[PDB]
Symmetry: D7
Subunit: 93 residues, 14 copies
């Protein structure tokens, strides 16, 4: 296990496609152990969701394009993890 | 485990059927490891519950329809997990 | 394991009988592994309690009848876990 | 693993006997695997402490009496677990 | 195990001896597994510390002899555990 | 066995570019770095504050400080360090 | 393991030497399994770190003479743990 | 003023009468300035409300007559103020 | 001022009419000093608002027949205030 | 405006007499501008409530006695304000 | 006396441009707007979420919704509205 | 107003004399408007209290001597307000 | 009073000039009732501060340039207020 | 009021002089409405206090020097207010 192993991003999203679509679909890409989508805010034209993605050697620009193939839009990359083992954020002042 | 593996959704519901009822019935569905339902807020007409359903390649359309047919009505999908392993949501400012 | 594996309900009850009785009893019902009763509040005349019951294929009606025959009533069913495996509640916005 | 396997009682005792006396004593009671006594609050005349007790088919009446024998006095019973397993309490709104 | 397995007490104490000593010292007492000492509040004359001390069957009075012996003063015993198994306080209203 | 620096957590200022999964891939492959983690602190218009949690074996704070800067980064403060045989977590207190 | 296995102290210090130094150099110390230094508060003059050090039969005096050598100043010993076992502080009212 | 100027009580109560009535009604009682009623928890059979009622010299029993009179049931009086001036509870350990 | 001076209810509602409508139209209502509508939760179907309405001798039935006219549905009456004076809820254990 | 102008005492009383009795009674005591009694906690045998009292050169011994006369019992004194002004307590680490 | 809409709180998506004190000045001078307040929610790379609290007399939600959009804004949701004679604040509850 | 207008200090003290005495007394000192004593904690042997004193040009030494002559010692001076006008503490990161 | 009345921005800042400089200086500009600078984070080359500025018809690009005239740098405009009267943010979900 | 009107700073200090001392002395300085000092953390050598000083056109250099000369040492300036009116900090994510 190497490279990007965990990606977390917040996207904006026309209400369609429905979000179990996105999950099902993001499963397929290059070595994805699994995806987590949680609903952030739920506005009227639109939808804020937090996508958590994790696997081996992940393809960033693949995800990033795969997502837009769905009329969905990355607002920001919240967190990235890379390397042999899965490091979490440590808190502090 | 593949495709959809855990689904979290909040549904509005008439007081009947009761909630254990739903729970029992949802244990049935195609590849359903198990179901949790906690009681959100219990207005006079009606009853908001939370639905936590996990399993292997769960069928979304199966579920929604199982709930409607039941009296329930789906307000949102709060969260989904799709893939080989359970990715929990990683939290961040 | 199948069906009703966890049941949590809040019931009003008179000071009688002493709570260890209801526990000591509801232990004995069909398919109950354990029972937990925590004290909620205690008013002059009466008494609120939460009642967690876990087991295999607990029959929802035995249980409730049991509590009634002891002189307390089910104000509400707060949570229910059903299926093969203990699904816990996933928290979300 | 049957009957009362955990009893938390809140009780008022005169200062004396000191708090690890009870601990000592109550441990030597039938079925009793263990005893925790934390100090709740302490007033001029008197001392409010909580008595968590764990074991196996515990005697509610021995205990009740045992505590009273040392000049203690049961203000209330705040928890009970009964059965083959320790069911902790599930929380909900 | 047997007797007291845990005793927690809050004590007042001059600045000296510095508290790593109290730790060391009490560690060497009869039947002591380990001893934790966190610093509560640091006053100008004195010092206020929590001593958690645990192990197999503890001599409460030895423990009280030893502390006083370094210029301690036992304000209160906050918690005591005894018996065969390490029961913790359970949370409750 | 591990020795030396084993985890480091630094806060840095960062030109929007390069994007952040750059850093993560990049840093990932340093000397004896089992894993890096970057969470995003604050995404200002001019710049962008981000937090790097780096972890490995006998780690070279100077290979790291230099690599970041190359990418145009800037260490503001180092917030945590764990050195030695075992991973020790911070304990809390009054 | 015996005597002190964990020591937590709050210290003040010049900006140099930078903190990953202080970390390196106490791994060096006698019987020190590892050290954790989180940054408490960074001022203009100076710089407040917390130092959590863990090992076997640690030497308080080596540790402390060493910190003064590095220019630092030990404000307080916030917690100490001693004996065979990592007793954590049990929290109470 | 004189006598009771404030009484707060928690009551259980069937769904009907809807609670704007209780408010209205109690407003018209002897010496009543105003009356606040917030909704605690909404159970299936019943309903749990807090009634804050205030004014000049209140007839406690009239207040208890009037509530019962609509199918109320007084679980407890939570707070009472009397005298010339409106003293509130002061916070303290 | 007399009878109800403040009423707070939680309601569910279609997205239309948009919420500044609902606001306008209850200012219209009889004896209504003003209304506050904050948005509780926005779903795909529907839309949960809280409605805080304040005035003199307000008419619960006008208010409520009016909300149903606008397509809405009143889930619960969360708080009511009645009499000459805006008694707020005094909070207690 | 001299001497004791506020006394908060925490006290255990048998259920009877009910709580607005004391309120009534204590108000008719010398110097006494007002009396708040909130309910602290309530057990099977007994009832713990807090008595905040406000006035002017208050008699500690009248009160102490007065409370005792009704079968009440002072567990402790939690606040005192004395002088020409009500000084509330300032908080600090 | 005031009538009609008197306070409105809306959340909008916003191209980084125009900058935010634009909006504030601009909106300030609408029909019967005693004051506007904009706090910044989240400053993403592509866009930017911001919150407008607008307040005045018999306010025209449609003059407002239109003005925002002109500046390239986009209402996502209206979060609060106060209409009528007096300013009523939300009361809280279980 | 000039000089020492507010003084807050935490002092240890024996159960004697009863706290209203220390208030009743410290009221009488030179330049004291009001005095507030809240109960901090109460141990078997002794007693912690916070002591807010407000006045004009309070002499710091009279006050302290006063408390000593009553048999409690000043553990620390938590806060002091000096000058013409009551400056309150401004909170900051 | 019209236009911008309140501006709040977070800037980055070489440690010089000192921050009482910035305050003193920002006072002068076109109609500034007053400025508030609080210290955010305090890094080693650098300094995060939150500037709050308030007056009549404020000159944005004046401030914005005035600030940089000091080797200081706007990272983001956090909040702006405009018009006849001073509107604060209202909170909500 | 003009120029500097309120200054908030945290300073490290030897135990002597005491803190009221400082307070008194700082009431003196050029145009000083009044001073607050609360006690932050009281390490063994030393004493972190917070300094809140407000007034009219306060002279910064005067102050720092008044504190140093006193034994104290300035770690940071946490906050300042300069202008015609006291702008408090307005808080935001
Ligand atoms: Ca974002
Ligand atoms: Ca930490
Ligand atoms: Ca409701
Ligand atoms: Ca929802
Ligand atoms: Ca994180
Ligand atoms: Ca009650
Ligand atoms: Ca979550
Ligand atoms: Ca007490
Ligand atoms: Ca739960
Ligand atoms: Ca102290
Ligand atoms: Ca519990
Ligand atoms: Ca930093
Ligand atoms: Ca701890
Ligand atoms: Ca505990
Ligand atoms: Ca319920
Ligand atoms: Ca208090
Ligand atoms: Ca209260
Ligand atoms: Ca109790
Ligand atoms: Ca304070
Ligand atoms: Ca929204
Ligand atoms: Ca309320
Ligand atoms: Ca104590
Ligand atoms: Ca502040
Ligand atoms: Ca920013
Ligand atoms: Ca609100
Ligand atoms: Ca310290
Ligand atoms: Ca500082
Ligand atoms: Ca704000």
């Amino acid at each position: 296990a190497k490279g990007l192993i965990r990606i977390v991003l917040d996207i904006l999203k026309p209400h369609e496609p429905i979000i179990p679509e996105y999950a099902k679909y993001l499963s397929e890409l290059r070595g994805v152990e699994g995806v987590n989508i949680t609903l952030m805010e739920i506005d009227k034209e639109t939808e804020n969701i937090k996508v958590t993605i994790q696997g081996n050697d992940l393809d960033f620009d693949e995800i990033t394009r795969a997502i837009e193939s769905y009329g969905g839009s990355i607002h920001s990359v919240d967190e990235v993890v890379a390397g042999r083992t899965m490091v979490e954020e440590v808190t502090t002042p």
